[PDB]
Amino acid sequence: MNIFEMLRIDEGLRLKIYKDTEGYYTIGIGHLLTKSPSINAAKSELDKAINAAKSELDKAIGRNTNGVITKDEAEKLFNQDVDAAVRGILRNAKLKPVYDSLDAVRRAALINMVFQMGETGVAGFTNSLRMLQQKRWDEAAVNLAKSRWYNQTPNRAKRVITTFRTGTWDAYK
DSSP states (O other): OOHHHHHHHHHOOEEEEEEOTTSEEEEETTEEEEEOOOSSOTTTHHHHHHHHHHHHHHHHHTSOOOSBOOHHHHHHHHHHHHHHHHHHHHHOTTHHHHHHHOOHHHHHHHHHHHHHHOHHHHHTOHHHHHHHHHTOHHHHHHHHTTSHHHHHSHHHHHHHHHHHHHSSOTTTO
16 A cells, blocks of 8 residues: 555546546546536537547647557556645645655545645645644544535545544555
8 A cells, every 4th residue: 555556546547538526527547637518518519628638638648649548658647646746745835844744654645635636725724734733633534524525525535534543544455
């Protein structure tokens, strides 16, 4: 168990563009592309949407991907996607210190959240981060459970939350 496995589990893997849970054009190990649109307003908006997706895709890939990729390709983006997140965290004056305060397993937990909801969003968990940084695991856990993140993605959140609290990988084990 490491951050990779952890998000590989949490994010899934598909080698053909699919409409995710959040309505985004997505591919690989949760590498979003485009934001899928509304209730029947296309074509042409549909077409434009997917194409943009493809384009975004071909961009990241370096080739004419017809919205279909390979494990190797997905996996390449995933690692990138991970890096970017670690980086957000360490540049972010809110996250940075929490991260610095954390341990290996707990770090993966923070990374996960960022990977999933981005630097800014994660950076807003003012109180939870506080607790985190103070090593108030249970308090933190409880608080994190009152979140929108949690309400919207309970299973996953639950998983992420148990890691912070126990400091183990039990919820992935």
